[PDB]
Amino acid sequence: DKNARVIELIAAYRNRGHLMADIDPLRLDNTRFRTLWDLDREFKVVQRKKLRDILSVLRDAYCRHVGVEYTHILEPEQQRWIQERVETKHDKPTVAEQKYILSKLNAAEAFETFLQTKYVGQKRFSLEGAETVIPMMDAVIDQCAEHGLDEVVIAMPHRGRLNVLANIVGKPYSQIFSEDVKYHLGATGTYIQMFGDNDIEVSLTANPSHLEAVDPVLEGLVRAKQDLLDTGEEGSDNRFSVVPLMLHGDAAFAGQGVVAETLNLALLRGYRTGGTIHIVVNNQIGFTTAPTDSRSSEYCTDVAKMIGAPIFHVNGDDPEACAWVARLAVDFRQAFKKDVVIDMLCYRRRGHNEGDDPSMTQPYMYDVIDTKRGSRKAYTEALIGRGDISMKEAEDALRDYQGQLERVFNEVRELEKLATAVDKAMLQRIGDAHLALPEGFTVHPRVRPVLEKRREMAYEGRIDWAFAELLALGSLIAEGKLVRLSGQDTQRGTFTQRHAVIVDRKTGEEFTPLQLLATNPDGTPTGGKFLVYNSALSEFAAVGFEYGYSVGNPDAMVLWEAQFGDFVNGAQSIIDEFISSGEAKWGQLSDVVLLLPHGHEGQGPDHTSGRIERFLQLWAEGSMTIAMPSTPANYFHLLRRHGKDGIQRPLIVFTPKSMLRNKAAVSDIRDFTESKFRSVLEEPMYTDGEGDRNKVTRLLLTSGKIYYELAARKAKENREDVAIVRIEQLAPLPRRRLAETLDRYPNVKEKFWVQEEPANQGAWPSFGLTLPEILPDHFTGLKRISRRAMSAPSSGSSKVHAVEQQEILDTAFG
Amino acid sequence: KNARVIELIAAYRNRGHLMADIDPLRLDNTRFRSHPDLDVNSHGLTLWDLDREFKVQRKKLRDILSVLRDAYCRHVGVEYTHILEPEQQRWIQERVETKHDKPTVAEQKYILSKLNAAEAFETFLQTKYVGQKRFSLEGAETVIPMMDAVIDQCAEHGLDEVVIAMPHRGRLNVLANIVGKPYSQIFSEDVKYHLGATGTYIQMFGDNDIEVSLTANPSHLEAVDPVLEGLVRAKQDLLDTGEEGSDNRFSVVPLMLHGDAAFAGQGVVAETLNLALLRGYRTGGTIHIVVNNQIGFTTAPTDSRSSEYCTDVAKMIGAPIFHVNGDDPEACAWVARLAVDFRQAFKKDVVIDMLCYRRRGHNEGDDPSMTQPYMYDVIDTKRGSRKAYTEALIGRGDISMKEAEDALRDYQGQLERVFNEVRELEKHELATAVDKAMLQRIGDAHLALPEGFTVHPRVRPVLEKRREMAYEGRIDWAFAELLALGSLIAEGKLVRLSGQDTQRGTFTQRHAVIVDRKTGEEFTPLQLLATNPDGTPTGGKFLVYNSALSEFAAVGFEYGYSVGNPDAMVLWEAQFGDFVNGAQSIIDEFISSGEAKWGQLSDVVLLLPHGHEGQGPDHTSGRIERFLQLWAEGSMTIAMPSTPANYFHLLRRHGKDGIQRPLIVFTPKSMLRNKAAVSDIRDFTESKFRSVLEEPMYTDGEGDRNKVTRLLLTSGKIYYELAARKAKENREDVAIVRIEQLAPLPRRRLAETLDRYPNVKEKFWVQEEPANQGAWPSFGLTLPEILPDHFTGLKRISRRAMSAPSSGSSKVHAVEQQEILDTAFG
Ligand SMILES: Cc1ncc(C[n+]2csc(CCOP(=O)(O)OP(=O)(O)O)c2C)c(N)n1
Ligand SMILES: Cc1ncc(C[n+]2csc(CCOP(=O)(O)OP(=O)(O)O)c2C)c(N)n1
Ligand SMILES: [Ca+2]
Ligand SMILES: [Ca+2]
Ligand SMILES: [Mg+2]
Ligand SMILES: [Mg+2]
């Protein structure tokens, strides 16, 4: 019965020992810590060891300065791996390793002392009380270099950022302190091993003040780099040689939903990066808020249990345990290609900002902090107290600090066009690819007519929207471009129109027809690739990832598709903080494409609008391209121009739903082979037909699918006095092309902007103000024909929709 | 040997769920092969050991193993050893590891009756109407007797209400067979899949009843999750149950339904779970039911999540998780009742993962064998839950051939009743001013400290300055806010105020809660106003909390709270208005549009610190232009007050007008401490809210309105800078008019004020925000149309159009600020 009580004791330490570990350097919770003859008896564990030695191994491993959470991991081999490395008696670090960790603590503290002394308003960014994160990050990067990896990419909030730039990225003081925006900009550097012969690239990504919003952006950036190096999921090796190193705060990590959304991507085929190293700077405070008001779990890291990640809670006043846990984390990530979370328990020495006396809201915590000596002073005293360094060396370490402090002060003192048309053979090849099935492949009987109709369209014309899209993407791959397309149910298409990936009816094997265009007819690679995935049910993390992918590989054609444009508001922080504004704020460029299914069809307020008015409001000084094409060929030329123009700026496309199957919304072969993108479109009766522009007295200006309904109504009552002009590119406004087009209708007495969207929505709120100002001689007196202003994108009734739709058409021809 | 048994017991308790027969489709064939953790020989035990008695009590290994396999490896997969509380693990362990008595024929027939009613509802829906395939509950009808068991167990505990939140799948079935709404109400004259509902559940075999309600929601999956919590917490606060109540029953239960792909992918799930035990947000535990049909439209679970289960996020708060086979309605009803008992015993969330399937395509244009041929060849060989359960009861000898025929007659009768009832239906088809003594009382309250309380030395001058302000005037913004909230509590109103660092204030200005310098005890001065001077309660209360670092779940919760208690004054404060875009879905889908779409009314207040001060693009704008764009047909009130007294009257009008519509307030940062931005006692005691404000030199001074030839129209703090510049140059030819209420535009008040300046030759809208931001994009178009005789020729003075709310440089901000001021006086 005694040997059974030992087995239960071993399991208790492994499962719950972390609840008794001395992880808090402030020891705020006192309640945390609240036979002898058997201790010298040998037990079978098959090895023979004395109970006192088994128990000492269990206390050192699980109840010392490291709290290990791993028995929640479903993989027995991963539990076994941790168990073996944590439960073995490790050899104490060498005097050289201790002196090295100490120099890193000196550099970090001197940097902090310099920041608060030289400049004013720097208290918010203070890393004082959390300096151990610097030798911890150093150990992460050094262990990644020891595995021979290519790059470590960092994402972090603002606390200690300039310290990371100087002591991790290795940026010189002259570059750091030159003129805050500096706390949001990206950076690149080279890490050179101190005791090794390896080097590794280290980069820091740009981010807003919005905590954790950069998390899926880092993942996308890293995946794009991993794809370029041919490493990982889409590569020839399983090394995933680009490592994401993600920094967090404790209140942010537990409260922001994007954390869970980004963790949810960790093992997905379209989003995995081979595991992220997470470091939580757990100072047990969020501004003035205590952890008991910030989370409903024991640890701020408990969300990471969602993906069975091992969690290490470590005492920030023990830099050796912190460096050891950082190296173990890199080894686990390398061995299992899964996320590791390091929870660094520390404190925030100063107030949150200049106007904060933290004892006002946390008197107890700050009476304990005011008793604490720095983790530098503590570690140097601890090295003297254990006899690991001499009195001369301890003075030298103290003199290393002074020289590090003097150096910053003295260095900062010293400082003080292309064609998008393809040939008919290119169209024919993309059409033929849909029927070039692998041997023994069984196409689903309802998919086979789609493949046959695409080979017919490629040779005979009447090209629909869905095929035009694949013609654009396919021709880019054939030219050597990497095309990454993703979104909810994007492989088949929400409207069963895409079939980018087709599934074997008998085996379930996937076949990608456009991937055949990555190989030239002679069998040589084009250098191009088609990467198409079904995303998780996320908007915030998925849009963030695709923006990040566009930044990681500026040469890639990156498209994200919303199920319906109505759901993109779930990614509003990414749209506001990165996509629309990254270039102006940080000089960070993104070529990301957002495909937003849009249009009034009676399917309700959440299946009608991509909120065109919101994107037009965000636009300024050529920041993005915003388009609503009405024709398959014009969409094809829009995608090819974006993929070939070399302008790294986002593209927002309001794509159709029912217009995908509108038989009037088809294009001729010549529209792809002898044309280009047209920002302004006239009716074909005036450009190709026998229509007379001089009979026109009423001009209707519009965009999107409503054109076909207006055109049908004009044809039904032969209204030669009315002309319909489409604005395909909403932003930047094609001022030049718009003026030249309207000049061709000299007898126009009235002009109307016609739209399906309510008066406070669509293009009218911006066009109604801009068009009379930009073109006063053409648009003074411009009137609106639309739905009435609504507090929702549309009515919930399809009957109300139909009445309103007819009301617009009747007003336009009244 | 005894050690190998202890390891075997732990293995079943920890990992037995990985071998449980939970999938009714049995898609993964490798699931039952290769499981050494649970294997006897893989632990160092033989067939000889099976008849040996072990200490666990003394029981044979064979009995230990039969108890473990029945409890953890049959149709229920139990995850609970991740729970840090040993008493919670032991509670589950005892109830799961005991041999339960088989359900009575009466209970079995009742479960079969609920499946009969659910399948008959689903059969009518697909047969009578077209375009109903997307709402089909076919393959998941066991969720109806499962929900019935939840509600019946809540009634058995004597609870007051169950509030349901769910996506659209099986919604009308829930309305008919759970909420109990009649078919005449359900199928009269879709929006019906988004509307709220209330009903009464009456126990079948009991004498208790319980209220059952369904909340309104958009098509945005999981967005309603925090809204349900807020709504339920508001109801708990009214019933004096829960966290802010004398009874610890939490007698209003949230029943939250989910889909498997959405539960794993939506971040709002984790944000809402994170609220579960917070003093300001806890609802005594939510019962979660995931309708896990192992598909999300055309997407397989392996592309939807990075974990074994769609429910693994719930481990974040140490919630017990039950994976149950949807083809076993008895195990499903049993797990539902156990979930209610756990929630009652520990006031924590329970998650039920119901494994089932989706019989049809996702919608009308879906042949799901196109994308999932294997799954759908397996679904095609499966007969429904009702039929399979009828056949099981037959084999077990629990019912006879006559009884099964009678159950099929019950199904036919339920199916005829829908068709018939719908056939018949088709055939017939205020003053806001307070007395000075009220102000003095709120001022005195700041110094009426509890005996032995130690005020922080930096907080004491704030308390003393508030008593001086209350008696002498020069009332600042921060105190005016508390004067408004305090006077409402004194009148009997419930005031709920929350947000990031809201107790102290982001700008160290509020001090709604003060903390004892020696003990950490909290003291709320405004809570003293809930008691009249005679000692009787006013009926009012002050509920003030620091929120978690969430925008989406926190704004969702506060919107839900205003719906749950329409009589409450509910305010949510952003740290900076720049971070409210994290809650855009709640703003777009509930706040701005809930009234027009569902008839659901909300009185929620959003306080959004706003203003250009050189702190960068994320500490400058609450995006006024976005709220003005969302506004239509008086859906919300949008204001930017420039004065403490005008803010006070704005909050009191909102709290007393009886108009259940949201209020959006763009609040100050540096203007909190602007010494010109103070109000007199008479502004609170003898005035009201002013939507349009003139300069005091014209209304109270010796200023001449007839000398004015240039009129500057503006809003917010820039008024003080424009006023200082006018005073500096003695510019009598320029007048500054403020628009305090941006939406609905005060058309009449604006027209009457401008008519008082007859010699105006030019008008300008002046703003700090870029030309594509602030009020200009809407005012520039609206003002010349609504008031053509006053605003034709209206010009803009602002910052240039920008792709961000401001520049990152405070030097660039300062130059642009001066440029605006010089253009206005050029
Ligand atoms: C999405 C978002 N919400 C709110 C804020 C405002 N904010 C800035 S710092 C802070 C508290 C941060 O707490 P924590 O994550 O523990 O980091 P710490 O400052 O302690 O390192 C908040 C709420 C923000 N920057 N982002
Ligand atoms: C936030 C959001 N994003 C996307 C959609 C579009 N959408 C509707 S149903 C669906 C798949 C749902 O999967 P699941 O949660 O498993 O539910 P099920 O339809 O299987 O019951 C999606 C992505 C949505 N309604 N909401
Ligand atoms: Ca481009
Ligand atoms: Ca109101
Ligand atoms: Mg913190
Ligand atoms: Mg599903």
UniProtKB/Swiss-Prot annotation, chain A:
2-oxoglutarate binds at residues 184, 209, 607. Alpha-ketoglutarate dehydrogenase and decarboxylase activities are inhibited by unphosphorylated GarA, and allosterically activated by acetyl-CoA, the main substrate of the TCA cycle. Both the phosphoadenosine and acetyl moieties of acetyl-CoA are important for activation because neither CoA nor the synthetic compound S-(2-acetamidoethyl)-ethanethioate (which mimics the terminal acetyl-phosphopantetheine group of acetyl-CoA) has an activation effect. One of its GO terms (cellular component) is cytosol. One of its GO terms (molecular function) is thiamine pyrophosphate binding. The keyword Oxidoreductase applies. Pathway: Carbohydrate metabolism; tricarboxylic acid cycle; succinate from 2-oxoglutarate (transferase route): step 1/2; Carbohydrate metabolism; tricarboxylic acid cycle; succinyl-CoA from 2-oxoglutarate (dehydrogenase route): step 1/1. It catalyses: glyoxylate + 2-oxoglutarate + H(+) = 2-hydroxy-3-oxoadipate + CO2; 2-oxoglutarate + H(+) = succinate semialdehyde + CO2; N(6)-[(R)-lipoyl]-L-lysyl-[protein] + 2-oxoglutarate + H(+) = N(6)-[(R)-S(8)-succinyldihydrolipoyl]-L-lysyl-[protein] + CO2; N(6)-[(R)-dihydrolipoyl]-L-lysyl-[protein] + succinyl-CoA = N(6)-[(R)-S(8)-succinyldihydrolipoyl]-L-lysyl-[protein] + CoA. Changing residue 386 to A: Increase in KG decarboxylase activity. Changing residue 184 to A: Loss of KG decarboxylase activity. Changing residue 158 to A: Loss of KG decarboxylase activity. Keywords: Acyltransferase, Allosteric enzyme, Coiled coil, Decarboxylase, Lyase, Magnesium, Metal-binding, Multifunctional enzyme, Oxidoreductase, Thiamine pyrophosphate, Transferase, Tricarboxylic acid cycle. Thiamine diphosphate binds at residues 159, 209, 211, 250-252, 283. Residues 388-416 form a coiled coil. Disruption phenotype: Cells lacking this gene do not show any ODH activity, in contrast to wild-type, demonstrating that this protein is part of a functional ODH complex in mycobacteria. Is a fusion protein with two major domains exhibiting structural features of an E1 and E2 protein, and a short sequence stretch of E1 localized at the N-terminus, which is connected by a linker region to the rest of the protein. Homodimer. Interacts with the FHA domain of unphosphorylated GarA. The 2-oxoglutarate dehydrogenase (ODH) complex contains multiple copies of three enzymatic components: 2-oxoglutarate dehydrogenase (E1), dihydrolipoamide succinyltransferase (E2) and lipoamide dehydrogenase (E3). Shows three enzymatic activities that share a first common step, the attack of thiamine-PP on 2-oxoglutarate (alpha-ketoglutarate, KG), leading to the formation of an enamine-thiamine-PP intermediate upon decarboxylation. Thus, displays KGD activity, catalyzing the decarboxylation from five-carbon 2-oxoglutarate to four-carbon succinate semialdehyde (SSA). This is Multifunctional 2-oxoglutarate metabolism enzyme. It comes from Mycolicibacterium smegmatis (strain ATCC 700084 / mc(2)155) (Mycobacterium smegmatis). The gene is kgd.
